[PDB]
Amino acid sequence: GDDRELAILATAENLLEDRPLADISVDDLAKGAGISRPTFYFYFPSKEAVLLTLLDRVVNQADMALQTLAENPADTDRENMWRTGINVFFETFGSHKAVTRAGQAARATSVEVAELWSTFMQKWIAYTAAVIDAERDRGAAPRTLPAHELATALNLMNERTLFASFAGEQPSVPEARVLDTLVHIWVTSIYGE
Amino acid sequence: GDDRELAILATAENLLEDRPLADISVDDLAKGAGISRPTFYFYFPSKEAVLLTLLDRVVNQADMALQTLAENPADTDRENMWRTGINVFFETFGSHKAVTRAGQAARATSVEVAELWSTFMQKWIAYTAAVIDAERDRGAAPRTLPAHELATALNLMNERTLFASFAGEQPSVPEARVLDTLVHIWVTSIYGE
Numbered sequence: 274g275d276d277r278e279l280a281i282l283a284t285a286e287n288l289l290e291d292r293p294l295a296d297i298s299v300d301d302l303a304k305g306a307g308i309s310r311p312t313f314y315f316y317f318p319s320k321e322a323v324l325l326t327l328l329d330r331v332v333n334q335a336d337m338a339l340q341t342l343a344e345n346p347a348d349t350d351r352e353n354m355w356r357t358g359i360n361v362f363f364e365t366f367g368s369h370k371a372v373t374r375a376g377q378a379a380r381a382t383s384v385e386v387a388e389l390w391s392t393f394m395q396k397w398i399a400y401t402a403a404v405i406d407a408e409r410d411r412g413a414a415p416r417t418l419p420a421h422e423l424a425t426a427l428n429l430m431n432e433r434t435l436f437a438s439f440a441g442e443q444p445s446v447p448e449a450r451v452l453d454t455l456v457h458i459w460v461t462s463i464y465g466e
Numbered sequence: 467g468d469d470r471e472l473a474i475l476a477t478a479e480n481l482l483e484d485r486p487l488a489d490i491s492v493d494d495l496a497k498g499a500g501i502s503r504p505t506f507y508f509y510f511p512s513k514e515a516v517l518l519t520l521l522d523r524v525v526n527q528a529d530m531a532l533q534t535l536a537e538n539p540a541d542t543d544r545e546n547m548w549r550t551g552i553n554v555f556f557e558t559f560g561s562h563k564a565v566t567r568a569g570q571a572a573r574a575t576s577v578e579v580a581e582l583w584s585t586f587m588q589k590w591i592a593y594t595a596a597v598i599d600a601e602r603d604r605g606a607a608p609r610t611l612p613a614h615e616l617a618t619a620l621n622l623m624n625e626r627t628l629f630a631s632f633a634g635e636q637p638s639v640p641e642a643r644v645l646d647t648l649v650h651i652w653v654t655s656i657y658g659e
């Protein structure tokens with residue numbers, strides 16, 4: 274039962290590494306999963322719904338890893354605390370580049386993809402703002418910008434910068450320099466006066 | 467001659483305010499410009515080429531305004547110098563929201579749109595890095611990150627943040643707060659140690 278669904282998902286992820294969703298057919302997905310085209314339609318109504326499920330898995334993987342980090346006590350080294358959190362996103366999405374690339378392109382055409390991304394960005398921005406607020410409460414960070422607005426711009430920067438680096442876009446920060454670049458901007462803007 | 471081309475462009479910009487490019491037909495563009503469908507094809511091969519020309523005009527408008535600012539002497543107030551430059555982009559793209567929205571969505575499907583955006587982002591990032599380098603040379607800014615990498619991430623942040631604010635995306639920084647938010651992040655990351 275679930276083995277066929279997982280085979281369809283694993284096939285779509287493998288094919289997305291070599292070509293976009295528009296160049297992948299239902300025949301290609303069914304062939305790779307070792308099933309017929311009508312058996313595919315039992316599990317998914319379209320190749321677009323396969324992508325949505327793949328993105329949902331990657332997004333929940335990053336969210337669960339962040340929750341594991343958030344539940345444990347806070348790092349006493351301010352810079353390190355932010356670097357470890359940004360690293361969760363760099364590693365999770367960076368381990369699924371083809372899904373990340375396809376998922377971002379789908380946001381323009383799919384209401385479901387746009388809604389899924391929006392829900393998780395709101396969660397991640399709210400947590401970021403809560404940590405900035407805690408840093409301000411303990412006197413470690415100055416009260417400069419509204420914390421939720423600052424958190425919004427820094428999360429949007431990471432989204433655009435990490436995904437440009439993974440895709441090797443021109444322009445982009447080299448993947449081997451992107452974590453240090455983002456951490457510097459987060460620490461200086463959060464603690465800087 | 468040029469009046470018909472300008473009428474097609476003005477019609478496309480007006481129609482993009484109410485619906486996406488996919489929902490606008492060549493008949494709609496020809497009707498608004500007061501021409502026939504075959505006369506339209508004399509000026510443009512597709513509605514996609516009309517969008518490309520609109521984006522080219524907005525991008526050159528922002529670049530020319532930045533060049534006017536760059537040619538004049540530098541502002542003695544460090545924060546203000548960066549705010550005036552970011553404001554060129556906020557005002558130029560913010561005065562053409564429908565073209566900005568459509569142009570960004572087209573980057574995923576059009577090689578020509580992606581190439582045009584890439585060329586101008588490289589120019590704007592290189593100028594940004596040159597100003598950071600001048601600030602470091604005069605001892606006003608510390609030598610922290612490689613200037614070109616820092617410039618890349620800050621320009622990508624502005625692209626994503628300004629365009630999310632203009633589109634009223636969830637999440638986004640309110641349009642009335644986006645300039646102060648970006649300037650704070652630019653100044654703290656450029657001058658901060």
Ligand SMILES: CNCc1ccc(N2CCC(CCC(=O)N3CCCC3)CC2)cc1
Nearest residue numbers: 342343347354355358359362397428431432
């Ligand atoms: C106090 N607890 C430790 C702790 C502190 C900070 C965090 N962070 C939350 C995540 C945040 C990064 C978000 C990001 O890079 N993206 C890319 C695409 C969309 C969001 C960076 C800091 C996590 C745990």
Ligand SMILES: CNCc1ccc(N2CCC(CCC(=O)N3CCCC3)CC2)cc1
Nearest residue numbers: 535536540547548551552555590621624625
């Ligand atoms: C010393 N001369 C005065 C001077 C100093 C700085 C500037 N800047 C160049 C532009 C830069 C902003 C770029 C930006 O917001 N975007 C949005 C979409 C793509 C690029 C901000 C600072 C301009 C003139």
